[PDB]
Symmetry: none
Subunit: 133 residues, 3 copies
Amino acid sequence: TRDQNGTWEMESNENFEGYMKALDIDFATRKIAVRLTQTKVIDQDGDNFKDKTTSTFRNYDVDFTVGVEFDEYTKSLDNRHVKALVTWEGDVLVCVQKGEKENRGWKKWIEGDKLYLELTCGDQVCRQVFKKK
Amino acid sequence: TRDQNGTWEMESNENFEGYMKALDIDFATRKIAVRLTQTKVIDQDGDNFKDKTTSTFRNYDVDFTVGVEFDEYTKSLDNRHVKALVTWEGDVLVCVQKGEKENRGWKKWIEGDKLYLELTCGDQVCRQVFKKK
Amino acid sequence: TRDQNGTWEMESNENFEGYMKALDIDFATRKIAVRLTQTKVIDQDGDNFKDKTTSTFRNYDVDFTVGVEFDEYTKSLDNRHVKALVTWEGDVLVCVQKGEKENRGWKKWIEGDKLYLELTCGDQVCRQVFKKK
């Protein structure tokens, strides 16, 4: 329909890297620009268009079920096709990601009203705490 | 007018790349920092200052009417000057960008509740889909 | 209580750079990703998880009193430690940053309704202007 009025949120960006390569875009900006998602608001009027694009960092999404190994390609970091399996050790979520790096995984649990997530790769561990809001 | 209380939004950024170059800033981070705009909140009180800065992704605005050729500076891509002309090809909004690049343009249409935008340069095509939320 | 449904806001990110360095992550993304804070949205259903993490640009806060030397670690810029002292030069706020780079400092003042900020390092000068909202 000729009507494009409304606010539109990006759902998929396909071959944005290849499109930028055809535009003689250097490697530096391309790697960050792909990480981005945009939301378009399009005021229209017969033939007159006003299009406002706002850019934000993309949305990293991991969708899984406990106990089943699923193939997840981490497009938000190093795009590796790790086969991730998450298990319950009590009520704490421990995940092991089969890949090139050893002892690679993460742990997610809750303490009252704060969420603790520890990402582990080798001997290094990053501890993040989240507040519900 | 020593009083600096308020929230200030960045209006112009001059020679920020040169300033960063004197600070030994890497090339990739510099390219992102220019793409950014900042808003500074400055709680004050005689000599005491409390300063909060938020950096966000500038906003790309393209305003056109069908059938008129407008000058477009694609700042959020390859900073090139293209002469763009948009026409109606059925219910698909087709734009041709006459410039240094040959088959450069895009096609925009609506199919129910998703907005489809296909960006083309030469033989490469970027496929984006947007959902109205 | 294993229940992780809700929207969670990040409170602390510890050793995320060290975690990424073991992942062969690029300094460019690492410098930005550390500058980033994340928000996790976790709607669940028995064993099914959906986790959406979106990042945003850290804030960076400088709190000072005129005539008092404060220690400034220039985060989100060149990660350098400077001893900064700010003074009043007329109605212009002048700061001198003692560090590895010479002639480093900034001046910020107001002329009616715009906030002017001049960042100086060596021979390069960055001039920013802010409008009150």
